[PDB]
Design a protein around this ligand. Structure first.
Ligand SMILES: Cc1cc(OCc2nnc(SC3CCCC3)n2-c2cccnc2)ccc1-c1ccc(S(C)(=O)=O)cc1
Ligand SMILES: Cc1cc(OCc2nnc(SC3CCCC3)n2-c2cccnc2)ccc1-c1ccc(S(C)(=O)=O)cc1
Ligand SMILES: Nc1ncnc2c1ncn2[C@@H]1O[C@H](COP(=O)(O)OP(=O)(O)O)[C@@H](O)[C@H]1O
Lengths: 125, 192, 575
């Protein structure tokens, strides 16, 4: 749930198509940190931007050769981050936090734990 | 432990006896009846091959006895000895915050020893009294200490000690959480 | 009488013996007009109780040769100075009934001298037997077959040319042969319909033909004890119909198997693995490479000979529970070649005991059972035992690996034995192992993929009753980096949870009838007949990744430590 919330927060500004199931992406990210999810979202946005710039440019380059040649239709080749962009991003998905240093954090949390044997403590009735 | 434990020998954990035990276990299971149980106070130094599947894989952690467990241990240790109903055992078990089974056994043994010494000394003196002053009518009052009393247990507990320090319990807790079932599947649900 | 039908086990050395002995015996007149030397002696060796004497008797009966049996201790038990007369008379009598077969059972008693050769009279017996055996004037067709537990137990001069020049290792029967032995030993007891002899055969690993017969007899005796004793109606001869009314039930066979104590479980097994490529879900590049290296030289030896290329006879699997042993078994199964597995405990035992001559014996055994896939599982065990980070002061060379290298260098002659090595620590493996002529073809086994994980889960859960509701593809995909061992553990835990729930539930339900006896008995069957979604969810709750990503990183390093350079990728010839 925290991963889903982080993904939603990162992608709020970016225009994301409703077809992309963000919950599936969050659940597939087994142990990604918030930084890793932000990196994945940034990579997806970068992929979308590169595709949009290349497609609009290559269309304009061909169109500019003949003056007024093709129709004046106002096409948006990529108007939202698509699913393929999210697969493109996940291909480079990385686990920043190794399980050994998570082991160390849980170790320090255990050492900070309130010892043992006082759970059943009860005042005499 | 014999080969070390902190630095040890230059070689790994493998040794002749454990290797033979592994070979016998691998060649075992045919009998369908023998069941191997292993106990170790130093799980960190145990050979990892011992824990592979087909070997002693099911690791079970035995923690220090709880208050109720301590009461049961005290009762078992004192079942044979004559213990006066006055001495409350639940209070003694609860008082022992972290005593191990061995520590409780030592406390019970020390209490029994104190009672035995007191009884021997008392009847010995009482025998002097008849030898020194022969009474006209023989009337034995029986045993001056027929069962273990509160004072014996208090004196014994005076010498009670915790054999197991909290640092070695911390290492065991570490290994236990070193067999940690991950941290991402706790909510695994099938798609429906 | 006894024949090929009686000879069970289908161990495929009886066929070799047949091919050996028909023409010398089945067509004796043929050798009279053709100048050829037949097999003067055949040494059948193997664990006791494997039917060597039975095989010899069956061959003698099926070929018509006069069978003569010279029991080892029968002659040895005779008085000194007249036992030699017994041996000489036995050979003369066998000579008279040409063609004849002389079988020497327990040959390791007449000529046990392994150059130690204690005593005086036994030296006379061995020397005279040698004179007789070498004294065969190639006239007539007497074939001398002898039985011995191991080839090295008998006097070496008996192993020399012309005395016993060819040897056959009958060996322990396999599951298929154990089943056929059970069938032959269970043919007049009117076996019950419930008992199939297939489950017993699979659970009968470690038994020999004598062991199988003893187990069958014990099951029959249990059946006789359970019934027909309560009635206690007995006479001089039990009625045939009354005895036939009983049927040996599966329970009796199960108890007998529990009370078996097989007479040589420890003996090494030479068996065609039953594992198949189906058990492993993937490794297509690895599967094809293994198929190439092993299968191609034999399936198409002519094409290998045409290009003048000698195929590599060694492959070293390296990887993190990923199925290397299973892959080796599968490759052996595809080629239908015998599989010999040398696990790490055996190597460690040879190293600790300073007994590396066992490597010579292991290689000889692999050579005899050709085609074979000699697999050295977890070959890095000795290096780990000596260290790995600092280790001993010396280098990677050790006694056991050196002996293995010597045997491999002296190998390749056989053209059939194929060495497969598996190691989880490629960094510490001795470099000499990877030199040409050794296990040079390094194959990396990676963690199973999603599809591979699905296949592994299916293979682990094939036997267990799994409800169709529980989706397996979802579980495999959910396990991002679980190893084959981890998936097996998850499946085992799910099965354990289901078993505990079923036991607890039926136990309570039985209290329920005992506490409140119902007027009409109507069992609702099993409350949990198959493994459900909740069992798998609880089991996965405890799922764990045994293999950390750092050790996978080290394996990736070594893999790219076998990097094909970085400048030739575009090599083009000048044209
Ligand atoms: C049925 C079975 C019983 C068994 O053995 C039971 C047993 N008896 N005495 C003992 S020992 C004694 C008990 C107290 C002290 C020790 N055991 C035993 C076995 C294992 C662990 N503890 C005890 C093994 C294995 C099996 C089977 C499981 C699956 C399949 S299939 C092809 O997938 O359908 C085939 C066969
Ligand atoms: C023709 C040939 C066959 C061979 O052997 C084939 C073989 N048979 N059974 C087996 S074993 C069994 C198979 C499955 C499990 C193991 N093999 C075998 C050989 C190598 C690797 N794997 C198997 C060797 C070497 C040669 C040759 C190559 C070049 C030349 S020239 C002078 O340059 O023109 C001369 C000779
Ligand atoms: N494959 C088999 N088929 C039928 N009987 C067998 C088989 N294998 C072993 N036996 C039993 O083994 C018994 C004795 O074993 P034997 O043939 O003398 O071998 P060995 O001399 O090595 O001990 C025989 O009485 C026979 O019943």
């Amino acid at each position: 749930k925290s991963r889903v919330a982080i993904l939603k927060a990162n992608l709020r500004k970016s225009p994301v198509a409703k077809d992309v199931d963000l919950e599936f992406l969050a659940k597939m990210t087994n142990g990604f940190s918030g930084a890793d999810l932000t990196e994945i979202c940034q990579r997806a946005c970068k992929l979308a931007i590169r595709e949009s710039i290349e497609s609009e440019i290559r269309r304009e380059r061909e169109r500019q050769t003949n003056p007024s040649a093709m129709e004046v239709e106002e096409d948006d080749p990529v108007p939202e981050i698509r699913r393929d962009h999210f697969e493109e991003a996940m291909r480079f998905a990385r686990r920043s936090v190794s399980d050994n240093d998570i082991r160390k954090y849980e170790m320090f949390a255990q050492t900070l734990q309130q010892s043992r044997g006082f759970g059943s403590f009860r005042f005499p009735s | 432990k014999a080969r070390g434990g902190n630095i040890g020998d230059g070689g790994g954990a493998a040794d002749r006896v454990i290797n033979q035990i592994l070979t016998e276990m691998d060649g075992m299971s045919t009998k369908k009846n023998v069941f191997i149980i292993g106990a170790t106070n130093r799980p960190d130094i145990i050979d990892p091959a011992i824990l592979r599947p087909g070997r002693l894989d099911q690791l079970i952690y035995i923690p220090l006895p709880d208050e109720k467990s301590r009461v049961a241990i005290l009762k078992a240790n004192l079942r044979k000895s004559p213990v006066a109903k006055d001495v409350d055992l639940e209070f003694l078990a609860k008082m022992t915050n972290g005593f191990s089974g061995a520590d409780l056994t030592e406390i019970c043994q020390r209490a029994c020893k104190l009672a035995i010494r007191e009884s021997i000394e008392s009847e010995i003196r009482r025998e002097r009294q008849t030898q020194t002053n022969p009474s006209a009518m023989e009337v034995e009052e029986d045993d001056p200490v027929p069962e273990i009393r509160r004072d014996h247990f208090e004196e014994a507990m005076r010498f009670a000690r915790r054999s197991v320090s909290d640092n070695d319990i911390r290492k065991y807790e570490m290994f236990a959480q070193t067999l940690q079932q991950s941290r991402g599947f706790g909510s695994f649900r099938f798609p429906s | 009488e006894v024949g090929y039908d009686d000879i069970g086990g289908c161990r495929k050395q009886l066929a070799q013996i047949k091919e050996m002995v028909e023409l010398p015996l089945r067509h004796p007149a043929l050798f009279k007009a053709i100048g050829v030397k037949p097999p003067r002696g055949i040494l059948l060796y193997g664990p006791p109780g494997t039917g060597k004497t039975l095989i010899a008797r069956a061959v003698a009966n099926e070929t018509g040769a006069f069978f003569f049996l010279i029991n080892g201790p029968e002659i040895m038990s005779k008085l000194a100075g007249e036992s030699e007369s017994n041996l000489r008379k036995a050979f003369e009598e066998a000579e008279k009934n040409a063609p004849a077969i002389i079988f020497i059972d327990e040959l390791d008693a007449i000529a046990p001298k392994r150059e130690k050769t204690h005593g005086e009279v036994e030296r006379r017996i061995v020397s005279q037997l040698l004179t007789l055996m070498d004294g065969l004037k190639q006239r007539a067709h007497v074939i001398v077959m002898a039985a011995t537990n191991r080839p090295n137990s008998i006097d070496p001069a008996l192993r020399r040319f012309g005395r016993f020049d060819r040897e056959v290792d009958i060996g322990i029967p396999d599951a298929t042969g154990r089943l056929e032995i059970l069938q032959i030993h269970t043919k007049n007891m009117k076996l019950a319909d419930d008992v199939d002899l297939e489950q017993v055969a699979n659970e009968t690993h470690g038994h020999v033909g004598a062991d199988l017969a003893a187990l069958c007899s014990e099951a029959a005796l249990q059946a006789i004890r359970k019934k027909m004793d309560l009635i206690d109606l007995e006479d001089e001869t039990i009625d045939a119909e009354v005895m036939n009314s009983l049927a040996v039930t599966m329970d009796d066979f199960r108890w007998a198997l529990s009370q078996s104590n097989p007479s040589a479980l420890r003996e090494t097994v030479v068996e065609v693995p039953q594992v198949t490529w189906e058990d492993i879900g993937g490794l297509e590049d690895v599967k094809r490479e293994l198929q190439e290296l092993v299968q191609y030289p034999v399936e198409h030896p002519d094409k290998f000979l045409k290009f003048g290329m000698t195929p590599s006879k060694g492959v070293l699997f390296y990887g993190p529970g990923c199925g290397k042993t299973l892959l080796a078994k599968a490759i052996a199964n595809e080629c239908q070649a015998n599989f010999i597995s040398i696990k790490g405990p055996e190597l460690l035992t040879m190293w600790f005991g300073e007994s590396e001559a066992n490597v010579r014996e292991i290689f000889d055994k692999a050579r005899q059972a050709a085609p074979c896939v000699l697999f050295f599982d977890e070959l890095d065990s000795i290096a780990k035992a000596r260290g790995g980070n600092i280790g001993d002061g010396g280098g990677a060379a050790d006694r056991v690996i050196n002996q293995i290298l010597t045997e491999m260098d002296g190998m390749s002659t056989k053209k059939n034995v194929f060495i497969i090595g598996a190691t989880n620590r490629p960094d510490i493996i001795d470099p000499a192992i990877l030199r040409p002529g050794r296990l040079d073809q390094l194959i990396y086994i990676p963690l199973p993929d999603e599809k591979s994980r699905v296949a592994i889960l299916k293979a682990n859960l094939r036997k267990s009753p799994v409800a169709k509701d529980v989706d397996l593809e979802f579980l495999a995909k959910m396990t991002n980096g679980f190893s084959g061992a981890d998936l097996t553990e998850i499946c085992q835990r799910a099965c354990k949870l289901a078993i505990r729930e079923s036991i607890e539930s039926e136990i309570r339900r039985e209290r329920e009838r005992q506490t409140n006896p119902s007027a009409m008995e109507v069992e609702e069957d099993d409350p949990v007949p198959e493994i459900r979604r909740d069992h798998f969810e609880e089991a996965m709750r405890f799922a764990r990744r045994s293999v950390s990503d750092n050790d996978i990183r080290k394996y990736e390093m070594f893999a790219q430590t076998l990097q094909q350079s970085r400048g030739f990728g575009s090599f083009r010839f000048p044209s």
